[PDB]
Amino acid sequence: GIGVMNIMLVSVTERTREIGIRMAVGARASDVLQQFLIEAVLVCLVGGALGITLSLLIAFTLQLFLPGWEIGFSPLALLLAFLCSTVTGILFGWLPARNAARLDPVDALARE
Amino acid sequence: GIGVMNIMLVSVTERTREIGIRMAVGARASDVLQQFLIEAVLVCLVGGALGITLSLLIA
Amino acid sequence: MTPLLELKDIRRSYPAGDEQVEVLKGISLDIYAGEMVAIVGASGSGKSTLMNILGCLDKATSGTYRVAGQDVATLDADALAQLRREHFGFIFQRYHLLSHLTAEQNVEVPAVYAGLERKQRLLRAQELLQRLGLEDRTEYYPAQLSGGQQQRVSIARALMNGGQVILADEPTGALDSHSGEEVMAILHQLRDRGHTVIIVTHDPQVAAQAERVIEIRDGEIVRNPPGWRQFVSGFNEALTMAWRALAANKMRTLLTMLGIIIGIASVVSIVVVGDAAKQ
């Protein structure tokens, strides 16, 4: 999951002029970290939903193979996986968008 | 390691005009696949060297 | 005698509404060495696309555009690129170049596709730079370079091929008439060098510099008034190109390589340790 941070870093890097027009409309320096990190953890959670979905697919897949082996749901582990996806999400998205918060609108606009 | 492909895809996506100036100087269609894939596997091998190095550190 | 180019009744057409439009119609043209031809005409007339024929970017599927007496229709597009190394040395208004390379490398590139020792062609390139009057600028990034000098780099870049044929997108339009028409005078020098050159412009004024204006409209001219070696050299030279591309993103490279490193290190780790406890 770590490289996703690199991905987002790239995406934001692409947004540099967009970052400048957003600061141009008076966005708070926090706000970019907000929206970006939220999008990142969003990806983490939707990927966690499709992920747990596929995991359940594997679960029934193992219901298909029952040499006495038995399925058993552990919902607490499910929610822990969710929160884990979340904390990894903030863990990855925090710093780069913090650096984005560091940025001046000026350089984000005038630069070519 | 799979996301590295996404990374390279992005990089090349950035290179679009560079791709055009390279085709402009008569590069073969194979040649871009050559240089790019070679660069990728290069990253794989240097990361494999530092990786095995760290693994030995663990050893 | 026979002109090195023979564009007779050649025309492109491209689909729109699932039918090809009249971007071009049958045109007769012939070209000698040393020609300095303007491409005057309305913008979007496909005279740019016609230049793409001149660039052999695509077959027109009509006429017989006989480069050196050889029609474009016969040869491979890769063979057309071989012709490009053999002849063509294109130059644009936007002076496109890698931000990556030093200008010497930006000139270096076309001959890389040729099979040749690097140092020799580097010396040739330095000769091309002194021909540009440029020397100190050699190590600079194009971003570090002034635009007219960058265009000069496009010229030397054309020159490394020998510049036997030269298309030219708006040579002076990106900048002042000073350095612009100056470079145009260098174009007159290459004309004096006898290599064929062909500027393209909708502007008559810059076209006045050319010895042969030719106006096109409605798809036709309204008038014509006068090796594995490079694979291993690819390995090391694009090794350097790789180092530079990584230099473009050392941090991204860092996260990427780390993603590799932790992986493989963990591989050998668990393999060896599990094998050892197993022992």
UniProtKB/Swiss-Prot annotation, chain B:
Transmembrane segments: 40-59
Top-level taxon: Bacteria
Recorded coiled-coil stretches: none
Positions in the Cytoplasmic compartment: 8-39
Subcellular location: Cell inner membrane
Family indicated by similarity: Belongs to the ABC transporter superfamily. Macrolide exporter (TC 3.A.1.122) family.
Quaternary data: Homodimer. Part of the tripartite efflux system MacAB-TolC, which is composed of an inner membrane transporter, MacB, a periplasmic membrane fusion protein, MacA, and an outer membrane component, TolC. The complex forms a large protein conduit and can translocate molecules across both the inner and outer membranes. Interacts with MacA.
Described purpose of this protein according to its UniProt entry: Part of the tripartite efflux system MacAB-TolC. MacB is a non-canonical ABC transporter that contains transmembrane domains (TMD), which form a pore in the inner membrane, and an ATP-binding domain (NBD), which is responsible for energy generation. When overexpressed, the system confers resistance against macrolides composed of 14- and 15-membered lactones but no or weak resistance against 16-membered ones. In addition, the system could also transport R-LPS or a similar glycolipid.
Record's protein name: Macrolide export ATP-binding/permease protein MacB
Lineage, opening ranks: Bacteria, Pseudomonadati, Pseudomonadota, Gammaproteobacteria, Enterobacterales
